[PDB]
Amino acid sequence: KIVNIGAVLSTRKHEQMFREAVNQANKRHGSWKIQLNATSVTHKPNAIQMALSVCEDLISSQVYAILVSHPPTPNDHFTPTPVSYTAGFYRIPVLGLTTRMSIYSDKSIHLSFLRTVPPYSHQSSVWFEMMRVYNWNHIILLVSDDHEGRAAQKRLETLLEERESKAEKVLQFDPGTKNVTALLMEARELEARVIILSASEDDAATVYRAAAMLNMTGSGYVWLVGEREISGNALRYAPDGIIGLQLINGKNESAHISDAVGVVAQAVHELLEKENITDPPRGCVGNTNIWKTGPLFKRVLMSSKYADGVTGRVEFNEDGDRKFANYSIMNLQNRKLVQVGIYNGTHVIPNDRKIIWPGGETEKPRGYQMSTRLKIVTIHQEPFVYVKPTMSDGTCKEEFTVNGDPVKKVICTGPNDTSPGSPRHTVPQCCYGFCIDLLIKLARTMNFTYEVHLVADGKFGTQERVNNSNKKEWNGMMGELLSGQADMIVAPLTINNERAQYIEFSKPFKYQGLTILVKKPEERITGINDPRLRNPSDKFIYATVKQSSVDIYFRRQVELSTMYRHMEKHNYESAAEAIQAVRDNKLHAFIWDSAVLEFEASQKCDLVTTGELFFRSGFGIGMRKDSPWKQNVSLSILKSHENGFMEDLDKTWVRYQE
Amino acid sequence: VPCRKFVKINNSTNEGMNVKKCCKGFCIDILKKLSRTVKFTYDLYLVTNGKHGKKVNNVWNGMIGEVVYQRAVMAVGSLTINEERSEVVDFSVPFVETGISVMVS
Numbered sequence A: 001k002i003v004n005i006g007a008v009l010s011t012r013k014h015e016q017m018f019r020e021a022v023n024q025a026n027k028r029h030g031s032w033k034i035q036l037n038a039t040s041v042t043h044k045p046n047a048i049q050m051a052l053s054v055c056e057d058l059i060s061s062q063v064y065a066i067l068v069s070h071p072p073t074p075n076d077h078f079t080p081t082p083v084s085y086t087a088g089f090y091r092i093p094v095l096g097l098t099t100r101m102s103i104y105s106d107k108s109i110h111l112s113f114l115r116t117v118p119p120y121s122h123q124s125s126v127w128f129e130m131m132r133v134y135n136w137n138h139i140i141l142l143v144s145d146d147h148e149g150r151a152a153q154k155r156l157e158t159l160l161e162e163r164e165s166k167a168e169k170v171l172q173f174d175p176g177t178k179n180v181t182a183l184l185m186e187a188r189e190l191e192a193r194v195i196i197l198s199a200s201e202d203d204a205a206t207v208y209r210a211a212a213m214l215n216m217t218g219s220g221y222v223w224l225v226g227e228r229e230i231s232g233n234a235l236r237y238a239p240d241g242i243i244g245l246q247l248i249n250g251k252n253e254s255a256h257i258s259d260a261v262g263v264v265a266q267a268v269h270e271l272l273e274k275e276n277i278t279d280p281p282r283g284c285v286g287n288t289n290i291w292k293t294g295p296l297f298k299r300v301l302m303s304s305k306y307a308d309g310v311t312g313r314v315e316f317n318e319d320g321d322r323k324f325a326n327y328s329i330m331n332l333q334n335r336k337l338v339q340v341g342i343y344n345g346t347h348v349i350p351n352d353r354k355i356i357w358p359g360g361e362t363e364k365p366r367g368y369q370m371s372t373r374l375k376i377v378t379i380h381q382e383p384f385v386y387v388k389p390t391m392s393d394g395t396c397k398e399e400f401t402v403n404g405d406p407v408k409k410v411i412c413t414g415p416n417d418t419s420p421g422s423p424r425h426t427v428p429q430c431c432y433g434f435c436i437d438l439l440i441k442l443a444r445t446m447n448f449t450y451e452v453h454l455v456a457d458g459k460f461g462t463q464e465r466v467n468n469s470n471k472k473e474w475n476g477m478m479g480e481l482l483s484g485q486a487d488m489i490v491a492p493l494t495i496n497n498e499r500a501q502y503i504e505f506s507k508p509f510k511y512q513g514l515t516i517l518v519k520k521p522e523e524r525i526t527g528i529n530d531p532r533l534r535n536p537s538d539k540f541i542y543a544t545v546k547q548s549s550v551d552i553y554f555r556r557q558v559e560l561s562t563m564y565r566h567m568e569k570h571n572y573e574s575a576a577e578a579i580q581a582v583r584d585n586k587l588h589a590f591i592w593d594s595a596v597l598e599f600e601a602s603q604k605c606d607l608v609t610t611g612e613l614f615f616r617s618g619f620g621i622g623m624r625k626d627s628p629w630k631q632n633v634s635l636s637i638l639k640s641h642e643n644g645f646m647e648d649l650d651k652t653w654v655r656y657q658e
Numbered sequence B: 001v002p003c004r005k006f007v008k009i010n011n012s013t014n015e016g017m018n019v020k021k022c023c024k025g026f027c028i029d030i031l032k033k034l035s036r037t038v039k040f041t042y043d044l045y046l047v048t049n050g051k052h053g054k055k056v057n058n059v060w061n062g063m064i065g066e067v068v069y070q071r072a073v074m075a076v077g078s079l080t081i082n083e084e085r086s087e088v089v090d091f092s093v094p095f096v097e098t099g100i101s102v103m104v105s
Helices: A012-025 A048-061 A081-089 A121-131 A146-160 A181-188 A201-214 A253-271 A294-302 A434-445 A476-481 A549-556 A558-564 A575-583 A594-603 A631-642 A645-654 B026-038 B063-068 B083-088
Strands: A002-008 A035-041 A063-068 A094-096 A113-115 A140-143 A194-198 A222-224 A243-247 A327-332 A337-343 A348-350 A373-377 A385-388 A410-415 A426-433 A449-452 A464-466 A471-473 A488-494 A510-516 A589-593 A614-622 B002-008 B016-022
Touching: A002 A012, A002 A048, A012 A035, A012 A253, A035 A048, A048 A063, A048 A081, A063 A081, A063 A253, A081 A094, A094 A253, A121 A146, A121 A194, A121 A348, A140 A146, A146 A194, A181 A201, A222 A243, A243 A337, A253 A294, A373 A476, A410 A434, A410 A449, A426 A434, A434 A449, A434 A488, A434 A631, A434 A645, A476 A488, A476 A614, A488 A549, A510 A594, A549 A558, A575 A589, A589 A594, A594 A645, A631 A645, A631 B083, B063 B083
Parallel strands: A002 A035, A002 A063, A063 A094, A094 A113, A140 A194, A194 A222, A373 A449, A373 A488
Antiparallel strands: A243 A327, A327 A337, A337 A348, A385 A426, A410 A426, A464 A471, A488 A614, A510 A589, A510 A614, B002 B016
């Protein structure tokens, strides 16, 4: 008829308040014969023999609730772990009260640990509530702590699953270093300015000093950290105007202990209304049997419903944390902490105090600086990308067309040849053609400059397993775009299902089908329906570009896998190699798009296309994810579609014949 | 597949009847294969306002008036695409290559 409560507490005043709350816990519960005894222990400068003394004293005491209430620990590890582990050896709930580490969030590791505080990742949820107020969609994550970094990124992806958006850049590395400045300069080149930081005080002061040396406290920069990053020398290195968080009654020890005693007491008086009430035996000497109502009492703690307390309502969720906590939002006004907001269970209310920013105005900084210099990557398309070496040094020969129009070239940068032939010989030459003048029209339309460069290979890009770690990766223009080295694939890119799963698309500019290049008895093929090409031989040589999207499109078509096993013996790197081989009568057929071969038939009259016109598809501009260059650019493309500018581009190259 | 059509009796009253009719063709097969793949539930009916869409003093008509004013969800049937229609709603990717032409003898 007795219940023991164990605690690790040092100060005699909080021990007296703890014993007074234990004595007053049986006040309003009538004249029932239950008794509540309390046992508190102090601290030894070590941690192993502390764990030993506490664990065997609470085994000999047979307590039901174990409390740790020491925020000023001299060790910066903040680990009450071994007492909770020894209680989890017999499945006894330990109620942690001070630390907020996410490693305690794992119920698989911490089988019988509960706490009345949330981890810091929920603060990012509050920062997700910052995404619901100021209409922000691109963040920059920086976490040094690898113990909580995976859980923080998992919670971040869970929060961004509702919007189905992704973070722009995430970083995890070893704490204690000082060169993170190159990563900060790479973050400077990004569009967003949202700085999310999750580390200790040393790494926070290091990145504050690194941002102060780079002078990242200008206009548009978003600064948003927590309570751990505004203490110690990080408070000395703190730039003004920074927006931080504050835990309401997180440091207030006495009311937290009183609320914990109320929660434990009402949980015990709820558990006394049930049967199958087992007791943990003397497990120190000759008793390794587990406490049989471990998960039962844990489920009793799962259904803990409350309506009274000092601060607010307390309830344990599927993770065992405190919900609906009130937070404070502080601002650093000239190295002075000024409160600028309050936070309810789910809602933010800024007060009448102004929001002073480190940059310019007091309104929200529109920190999405879009790319005004687009790194344009392209592949060498023969009717679209005409590449010519310069005359003397970086100049373009302004040749005139037959319509009185000078050719508007561009200084592109490209290699000589492929990697076995020419490994690294990249020069700036002059590029012009269809998509070059299309990009010139886009630059005339919108507010941007650009940077035209080429791709290192002659391939679009296919998904293939890299030989280490058994992972499928990309290459080509998709491999260079997703690496961040490029900005916009301006190329006749093959639109299919697999590419749209990873990036976003625009409206297609080119619309054409598929055909067969032959040379001119039926010398023609009449498309795919030739029965001699269904079961091929060494006579009719049909082939395609190596690592092309037509190969993937025919790889999905499992009913013509024999053509998949036939073109693999004759895969060519570029289409110009196929033109050179079919002019010298080494090839016999070539699956390729319609209008390119029609232009080559206008070049050379012996080139003949086939009769069947299948897979009438469209080619557009390769794009990034959700970006401010999506809606404006698609409206500009549609404006180019509605007028006769497509006919003008036909008059440049397509409609003209030779 | 069945559908309804709100056919009015006269011009004297606005009261009509929802006559149920059958439909087949291209877009019917497209919608049936979408129901095979996605495995959802659809609510198919016909519009009685008129043609595709035309704004008369910030008032659209037809399928544009049904979709933009949110009396429906999506337009599966045939619809031309221009600038302001792409401004008011979000079209999908194009699947069929249908332009304009001139019929002569």
